Amino acid sequence: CGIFAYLNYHVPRTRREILETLIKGLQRLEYRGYDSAGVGFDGGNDKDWEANACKIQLIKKKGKVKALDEEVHKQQDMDLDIEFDVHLGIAHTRWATHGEPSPVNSHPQRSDKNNEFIVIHNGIITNYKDLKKFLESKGYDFESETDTETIAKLVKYMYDNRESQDTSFTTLVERVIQQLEGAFALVFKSVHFPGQAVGTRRGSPLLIGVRSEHKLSTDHIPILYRVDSTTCLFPVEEKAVEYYFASDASAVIEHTNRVIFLEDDDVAAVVDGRLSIHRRAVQTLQMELQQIMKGNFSSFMQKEIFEQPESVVNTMRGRVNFDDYTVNLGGLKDHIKEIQRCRRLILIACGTSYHAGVATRQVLEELTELPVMVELASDFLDRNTPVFRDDVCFFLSQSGETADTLMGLRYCKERGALTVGITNTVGSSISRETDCGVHINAGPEIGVASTKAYTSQFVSLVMFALMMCDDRISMQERRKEIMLGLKRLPDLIKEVLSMDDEIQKLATELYHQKSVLIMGRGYHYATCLEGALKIKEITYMHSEGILAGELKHGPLALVDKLMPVIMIIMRDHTYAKCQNALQQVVARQGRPVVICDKEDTETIKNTKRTIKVPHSVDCLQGILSVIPLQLLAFHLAVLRGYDVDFPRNLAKSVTVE
Amino acid sequence: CGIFAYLNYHVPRTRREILETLIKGLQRLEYRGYDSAGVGFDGGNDKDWEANACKIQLIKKKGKVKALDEEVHKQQDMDLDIEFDVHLGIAHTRWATHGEPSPVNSHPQRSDKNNEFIVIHNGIITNYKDLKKFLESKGYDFESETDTETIAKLVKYMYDNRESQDTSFTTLVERVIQQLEGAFALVFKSVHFPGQAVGTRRGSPLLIGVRSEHKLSTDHIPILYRRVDSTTCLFPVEEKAVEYYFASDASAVIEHTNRVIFLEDDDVAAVVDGRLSIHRIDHPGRAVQTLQMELQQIMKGNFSSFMQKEIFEQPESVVNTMRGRVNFDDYTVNLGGLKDHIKEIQRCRRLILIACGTSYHAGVATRQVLEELTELPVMVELASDFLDRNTPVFRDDVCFFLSQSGETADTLMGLRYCKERGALTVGITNTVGSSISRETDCGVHINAGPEIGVASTKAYTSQFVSLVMFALMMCDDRISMQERRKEIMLGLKRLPDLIKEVLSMDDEIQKLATELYHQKSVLIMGRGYHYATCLEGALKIKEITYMHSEGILAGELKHGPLALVDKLMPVIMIIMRDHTYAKCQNALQQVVARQGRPVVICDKEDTETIKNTKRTIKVPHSVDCLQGILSVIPLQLLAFHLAVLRGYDVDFPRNLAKSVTVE
Ligand SMILES: N[C@@H](CO)[C@@H](O)[C@H](O)[C@H](O)COP(=O)(O)O
Ligand SMILES: N[C@@H](CO)[C@@H](O)[C@H](O)[C@H](O)COP(=O)(O)O
Ligand SMILES: N[C@@H](CCC(=O)O)C(=O)O
């Protein structure tokens, strides 16, 4: 889900400039949820903008943001020419995991048929059912089935029973969050408090951007406890200021790089155009707009696949020295010694991040000599897996906010384990709450299906492995072999990408099929699992990864001349076994596409369709063997008329149940 | 693939009776699959059996054993009424590997046109190329494309180049196997050693049954290294009469006798003058042991298939797995196979479960309760991947090897891997005498009876119960877990009846089979205790029905796989009354929200989901760590019924190995 609001204080914006800013803000957040969208602004058509803050307009529609962008326009009642010197507008895109994605369930929610309070919510209220029964007895009627409505009907209940005629908007919000259980990130707007916004969070991201040609009064807003000129963030001499409430930084970087990341239970409030926190640090974002632009590519996913030569380099930058063959991960310098005195490695993650652990488990066992266990976070929690004080627990999360991975982290901390975060998001929950960690530095990933995040996690775990064995004489040559492979890896990725057209041709032979089996073993078990997940996610074909050594134990019965099959046969120590699996598939009349090495002349002669990738070190080959399956999934989706950036039935980053 | 030889020594039998015994032996071996079979026996129609011992007749044929039986009785020049006081007949079912199926490539393979030596073989001789060249240079002409023929030609080469006129049959075979490379189980017969048999193995099972109305000299045959006298071999004491049964599978012996000797690698067993001795290149020996197997356990009975039988008899097989091991009278568990090792096991620091296929799913199905009751780390490994990674293993690891057959290559090699590293090894098997039961430090026989069906049904649930019982032993000294143990054991007490209740819903499962009759895919979703149920159900439907069924961990839906859900994709969800109930409901709402209309396997009394879901399979409630047994049976039946509807033979393997090398 996504939150975005635009508060222009004494910065004249017409009603069109504001709506185009709310839509443009949701477009930056659409990848977090694109089942429905909505906006909330001030209505009325009075030239004097002051006589219009008493009328709230809600435009909510089902579909992506482009369905709302057109619903907002071509309306017969809203005059898009009213100049507003002061105005507040809130927007939201929703990931409808439950129920229908109807406009009544989309945000902003309302508290009554006159819109006295409207709120946009990211998260879940674990006791909204109790709140719903309490509010219905006092005289409040509910319309939607969402848990967000109990937040709107309640902020109005605290307003209908206040003690003084002018209780601050903060006091009303403070009484609400005290009755809310679970996680949430809220942004309120009310007719009674014109132009005033309130932003509180608890277990969900919520920052506040600021732009102004004037100087700011401070760069460290002091948190308060239940507000003068030496307490609020505001322009000194004049009033020109623009705020940008948002649950992510991509929606704000386009307008300014000065945000204030709030914290749990911090109740920010903009009053008279002054930002004050109740119960901070105005900082510069380290992100360029180009990082969240498609560039010359037709889709984010295509960009992020073809940029893997660069993102791999950025992952190793300032960490790998090829002249002296040294590896240093600054994020682990103060813990690497204690990590080596531990007795077991546990990798915990979901989805593609889990596959990155599968892809590096073998080399981690080799170079650390420690037991390495790889766990799906959801199952890890269901079983109450035993964890001990001398366990090192890794948490792989591109977003750093995945619910199951994050709860596994707090589970392992409670048991005294040493926790390490492998993240792609600075300041994320998982990067903060782990004892140490590594930022893979692959750049923002906008496509729902992770591509560069996987290969960057892969490389990051390999670098950790190289550190763990940098004091073993017997492993020096093995380290050199691996590091030379890493030096040559960016160019070999480029070689794989040059086969883009050859992959597209094979896709034309498969897009009509209902199923495909992807078979691999050893280092390429993860490859066939990740490839199967990608084809599932964006093409909707029934693709499944099958461990090659397991074919003879049942799954081989599903192979015939009609069943599409992709096999991975690389020149490592399992080559002979992979050839036996291939012979078994052929005996069953299978006609598989084989991903193999360029020099594998035997395989290339005896197989019609082969994807010939260049050879790398065995423990790095998984990076090269997965890219063709990334490309294949992309082309299959295009052939089937689907969107590769917005696959049906989900969005990016699972931050709730 | 199947070996059977019958040696009657001073037990008069007619040629008819001998041939009927050989055929009946192969009938017990057909379930393993084969493309041809043959028999070898003494020819000639001289009324005195002693003169016919120099004429070996062969009857081999491509096809089913029934056709072979017709060919036997269809011999105008063969008199079936000659009585043999002493005779050795051998029989074999072949699964072609080298040389296409044909009469010439069938067993027994002969050493020359006069059949001086014949041999039946299970396995593959790797260096059969080199051996063939050598024997051709010495003047031996080959007539078949089988690797086996090199064995028959080589034993005649040793005979033709023997130093003394009275070199033993054993010595010849010893010299043969010392030149062979690979895996083999062999039985030899020769006109130069009438009435004698020699059996040997390396990497393939071979056993010997024995029957005599007279007392036997011993129940422990001592090994002889390179004097064969009355104190060193097996034989009837006061009289000569005795019968021997060589076989690669006890199923071909059990109807005649339950006293068997399991040979080990490089053993050379020989019957000379009706006396069985075991040669080899305190005092080691081979035990004559009693099998508790019965012929009825390998017969369909009133069922139309072995798959149907082994599914529907699971109330009985679960009871057999628990017999003598669970005392509901005082809530105690005793696995006799672990008595001398339970103490060490409790001092170890990690459990590793290693297996392939459905046996691996048995580990996944019990991982959680093992973690709970042992409080140790529990790692579940697919044997093939375990080997590829050179997984770290330590002296204080307890490694379990789950295998119905006890012979699966990758599982067995994982066992030997762990032994080299000093780990305590434990075998969970269903085949007495198998490699994994022998080479583990200790083990548990799950005692589900032989599994004749192609797919693992009762073996899975019996493994499930066996691992739960082990878990109950590991926590029997913990006060805080007494209640939890009682709850689980009362569940085991009620489990056989709860299985019958599930089996009584067979009609409801058929209705579901007709709904999926035309479908090409089905997603089976679950989590926690029922993750294994999804994986095992998906494997069954793949293996038996040949449709693309896949098990999906419910917690992973929102991470990608949920994109497959729409109004067309068939889905089966498992929602039971355990601690993951709310999370499973969430997954159900996620599926429905995307136009999915799934079939739900749920508890009988889950009124909410039964009303909000059209088709529900309503199983009875049990302990959470036992529900997996009840929720998997409907998927076993589903796979069975779908295959029947689509005209498939559920007792037909299909899953064949690599093609036949024609050379
Ligand atoms: N990338 C998606 C699959 O293409 C999804 O599986 C993703 O990996 C999963 O949601 C985990 O997200 P995270 O890396 O941010 O924790
Ligand atoms: N029987 C099959 C399951 O349907 C197969 O997966 C089997 O479980 C696997 O081959 C392992 O065999 P094992 O139990 O004899 O070791
Ligand atoms: N390799 C031998 C025996 C195979 C077997 O039946 O096990 C053959 O193909 O004839």
SS (H, E, C) B479-532: HHHHHHHHHHHHHHHHHHHHHHHHHCCHHHHHHHHHHHCCCCEEEEEECHHHHH
Among all residues of chain B, which has the CA nearest to that of A554? B543
Inter-chain residue contact B564 with A540, CB threshold 8 Å? yes
Breaks (C-N over 2.5 A) in chain B follow: 226, 281
Do the Cβ atoms of A87 and A7 come closer than 8 Å?
Answer: yes
A295 conformational bin, left if phi > 0, alpha if psi -120 to 50, beta if neither: left
- Nearby residues of B623 by Cβ (< 8 Å), 6 or more positions away: B487, B488, B490, B491
> Which segments of A330-451 does DSSP mark as H helices, in order?
336-340, 351-368, 377-382, 403-414, 429-433
Q: What angle do CA A307, A308, A314 make, to 5 degrees?
A: 95
Instruction: Count Cα atoms within 13 angstroms, Cβ side, for B599.
Output: 22
Other C-beta atoms closer than 10 Å to the C-beta of A74 total 7
CB-based burial of residue B289 (10 Å sphere; 0-12 exposed, 13-18 middle, 19+ buried)? Answer: middle
CB-based burial of residue B318 (10 Å sphere; 0-12 exposed, 13-18 middle, 19+ buried)? Answer: buried
**Chain B interface disruption, residue of A380, A448, A454, A649, most B CBs within 10 A:** A649
User: Does the beta carbon of A449 sit less than 6 angstroms from any atom of ligand 1?
Assistant: yes
Specify the 3-state DSSP secondary structure of A641. coil
User: Does the beta carbon of B144 sit less than 6 angstroms from any atom of ligand 2?
Assistant: no
Could you tell me which CATH class the domain A499-657 is placed in? alpha beta
Phi, psi (rounded to 5 degrees) for A161:
-140, 30
Tokens of A101: 């994605």
* Strands across the sheet containing B378-382: B378-382, B350-355, B397-403, B424-429, B442-445
Rounded to an integer, what distance in angstroms lies between the CA atom of residue B338 and that of residue B441? 9
Rounded to an integer, what distance in angstroms lies between the CA atom of residue B461 and that of residue B407? 19
For residue A362, the chain B residues in CB contact (below 8 A) are: 388-390
Q: Give CA separation, A414 vs A113, A388, A434, in Å.
A: 47, 10, 12
- Nearby residues of A139 by Cβ (< 8 Å), 6 or more positions away: none
Rounded to an integer, what distance in angstroms lies between the CA atom of residue B246 and that of residue B197? 9
Among all residues of chain B, which has the CA nearest to that of A378? B555
Tabulate helix, strand, coil % of chain B (nearest 5): 40, 25, 35
Secondary structure of B259-312 as H, E, C letters? EEEECCCCCEEEEECCEEEEEECCCCEEECEECCCCHHHHCCCCCCCHHHHHHH
DSSP β-bridge partners for residue B350: B397
User: Does the beta carbon of A397 sit less than 6 angstroms from any atom of ligand 1?
Assistant: yes
Phi, psi (rounded to 5 degrees) for A130:
-65, -45
Rounded to an integer, what distance in angstroms lies between the CA atom of residue B342 and that of residue B345? 5
A164: annotated binding-site residue? no
Between A350, A362, A554, which is nearest B543 by CB? Answer: A554
Terminal CA-to-CA distance of chain B, rounded, Å? Answer: 21
Rounded to an integer, what distance in angstroms lies between the CA atom of residue A99 and that of residue A119? 20
DSSP β-bridge partners for residue B402: B428
Q: What angle do CA B375, B377, B382 make, to 5 degrees?
A: 135
Inter-chain residue contact A583 with B527, CB threshold 8 Å? no
Tokens of A542: 């029934």
CA-nearest of B574, B373, B353 to B474 is B373
Do the Cβ atoms of B433 and B208 come closer than 8 Å?
Answer: no
Rounded to an integer, what distance in angstroms lies between the CA atom of residue A25 and that of residue A19? 10
Among all residues of chain A, which has the CA nearest to that of B366? A383
Q: Please report, for chain B, the start and end positions of each structural domain, with discontinuous segments joined by +.
A: 2-296, 300-503, 505-650
Do the Cβ atoms of B263 and B286 come closer than 8 Å?
Answer: yes
Give how far the C-alpha of residue B197 lies from the chain's centroid of Cα atoms, to the nearest Å: 26
Terminal CA-to-CA distance of chain A, rounded, Å? Answer: 13
Q: What angle do CA A52, A54, A60 make, to 5 degrees?
A: 90
CA-nearest of B646, B623, B423, B360 to B519 is B646
Give how far the C-alpha of residue B60 lies from the chain's centroid of Cα atoms, to the nearest Å: 26
Among all residues of chain A, which has the CA nearest to that of B528? A382
User: Does the beta carbon of B358 sit less than 6 angstroms from any atom of ligand 2?
Assistant: yes
CA-nearest of B595, B566, B572 to B584 is B572
Around ligand 3, the residues with Cβ closer than 6 Å are B 1, 94-99, 121-124, 146-148
Q: Whose CA is nearest to atom 1 of ligand 3?
A: B124
User: Does the beta carbon of B310 sit less than 6 angstroms from any atom of ligand 2?
Assistant: no
Radius of gyration of chain A (CA): 27
A116 conformational bin, left if phi > 0, alpha if psi -120 to 50, beta if neither: alpha
Do the Cβ atoms of A535 and A633 come closer than 8 Å?
Answer: yes
Do the Cβ atoms of A440 and A461 come closer than 8 Å?
Answer: no
Q: What angle do CA A465, A466, A467 make, to 5 degrees?
A: 90
B137: annotated binding-site residue? no
Tokens of B536: 């095992």
β-strand A515-520 against A542-547: which pairing, if any?
parallel
Between A378, A574, A588, which is nearest B553 by CB? Answer: A378
Phi, psi (rounded to 5 degrees) for A30:
-60, -35
CA-nearest of A202, A229, A483, A281 to A367 is A483
CA-nearest of A481, A439, A485, A494 to A613 is A494
Rounded to an integer, what distance in angstroms lies between the CA atom of residue B470 and that of residue A388? 23
Do the Cβ atoms of A378 and B357 come closer than 8 Å?
Answer: no
Give how far the C-alpha of residue B210 lies from the chain's centroid of Cα atoms, to the nearest Å: 22
Specify the 3-state DSSP secondary structure of B221. strand
- Helices A476-497 and A308-316, packing angle to 10 deg: 150
Inter-chain residue contact B350 with A371, CB threshold 8 Å? yes
Do the Cβ atoms of A349 and A454 come closer than 8 Å?
Answer: no
- Nearby residues of A74 by Cβ (< 8 Å), 6 or more positions away: none
Q: What angle do CA B95, B96, B100 make, to 5 degrees?
A: 150
* Pairs of residues, one from chain A and one from chain B, whose beta carbons lie less than 8 Å apart: 184
Rounded to an integer, what distance in angstroms lies between the CA atom of residue A53 and that of residue B161? 113
Phi, psi (rounded to 5 degrees) for B451:
-105, 105
CA-nearest of B512, B7, B506 to B272 is B7
Ligand 1 geometric centre to CA of A353 (Å): 6
A165: annotated binding-site residue? no
B1 tagged catalytic: yes
Per-position b or e across A149-184, b if 16+ CB within 10 A of its CB: bbbbbbbbbbbeeeeeeeebbbbbbbbbbebbebbb
Ligand 2 geometric centre to CA of B454 (Å): 9
> Which CATH superfamily does the domain covering B300-503 fall into?
Glucose-6-phosphate isomerase like protein; domain 1 (3.40.50.10490)
For residue B385, the chain A residues in CB contact (below 8 A) are: 521-522, 525, 547, 549
**Chain B interface disruption, residue of A97, A382, A397, most B CBs within 10 A:** A382
Q: Which CATH architecture has domain A297-497?
A: 3-Layer(aba) Sandwich (3.40)
Rounded to an integer, what distance in angstroms lies between the CA atom of residue B635 and that of residue B650? 15
The distance between the two most distant Cα atoms of chain A, rounded to a whole number of Å, is: 86
Q: What angle do CA B68, B69, B75 make, to 5 degrees?
A: 90
β-strand A418-423 against A391-397: which pairing, if any?
parallel
Ligand nearest to the CA of B543: 2
Per-position b or e across A130-147, b if 16+ CB within 10 A of its CB: ebbeebeeeebeeebebb
Q: Which CATH architecture has domain B2-296?
A: 4-Layer Sandwich (3.60)
- Indicate the fold that domain B505-650 takes in CATH: Rossmann fold (3.40.50)
Tokens of A580: 């036996």
- Which helix (H) or strand (E) segment is A424 a member of? none
The residue written with tokens 């010997």 in the block is B208
CB-based burial of residue B302 (10 Å sphere; 0-12 exposed, 13-18 middle, 19+ buried)? Answer: exposed
Question: How many residues in chain A?
Answer: 657
A543: annotated binding-site residue? no
Q: Whose CA is nearest to atom 9 of ligand 2?
A: B357
Phi, psi (rounded to 5 degrees) for A234:
-165, 160
Inter-chain residue contact B556 with A370, CB threshold 8 Å? no
Radius of gyration of chain B (CA): 27
Could you tell me which CATH class the domain A2-289 is placed in? alpha beta
Inter-chain residue contact B590 with A537, CB threshold 8 Å? no
For residue B547, the chain A residues in CB contact (below 8 A) are: 558
User: Does the beta carbon of A398 sit less than 6 angstroms from any atom of ligand 1?
Assistant: yes
Per-position b or e across A268-295, b if 16+ CB within 10 A of its CB: bbbbebbbbbbebebeebebeeeebeee
Q: Say whether A499-657 and A297-497 share the same fold.
A: yes
- Which helix (H) or strand (E) segment is A107 a member of? none
Do the Cβ atoms of B26 and B91 come closer than 8 Å?
Answer: yes
Among all residues of chain B, which has the CA nearest to that of A375? B379
Do the Cβ atoms of B250 and B432 come closer than 8 Å?
Answer: yes
> Which segments of A498-561 does DSSP mark as H helices, in order?
500-508, 525-534
CA-nearest of B288, B335, B372, B569 to B466 is B335
Between B590, B656, B658, which is nearest A580 by CB? Answer: B658
* Cis amide bond preceding A222, omega within 30: no
Do the Cβ atoms of A653 and A558 come closer than 8 Å?
Answer: no
Specify the 3-state DSSP secondary structure of A320. strand
Do the Cβ atoms of B191 and B152 come closer than 8 Å?
Answer: no
The residue written with tokens 């969107």 in the block is A643
Rounded to an integer, what distance in angstroms lies between the CA atom of residue A151 and that of residue A331? 40
Do the Cβ atoms of A652 and A448 come closer than 8 Å?
Answer: yes
A397: annotated binding-site residue? yes
Say what the alpha-carbon torsion angle B374, B377, B382, B385 is, to the nearest 10 degrees.
Answer: -160
**How many angstroms separate the CA of residue B579 from the nearest CA in chain A?**
8
CA-nearest of B331, B381, B382, B317 to B351 is B381
Rounded to an integer, what distance in angstroms lies between the CA atom of residue B598 and that of residue A609? 37
* Strands across the sheet containing B259-262: B56-62, B36-42, B83-94, B2-14, B242-247, B207-211, B259-262, B289-290
Tokens of B629: 């047994």
Per-position b or e across B171-201, b if 16+ CB within 10 A of its CB: bbbbbbbebbeebbbbbbbbeebbbbbbbbb
User: Does the beta carbon of A428 sit less than 6 angstroms from any atom of ligand 1?
Assistant: no
Tokens of B199: 């059996």
Rounded to an integer, what distance in angstroms lies between the CA atom of residue A95 and that of residue A106? 9
Counting ligand 3 atoms within 8 A of each CB, the residue from B34, B95, B662 with the most, and so the one to mutate, is B95
Rounded to an integer, what distance in angstroms lies between the CA atom of residue B469 and that of residue B325? 8
> According to the entry, how was the structure determined?
X-ray
- Which helix (H) or strand (E) segment is A548 a member of? none
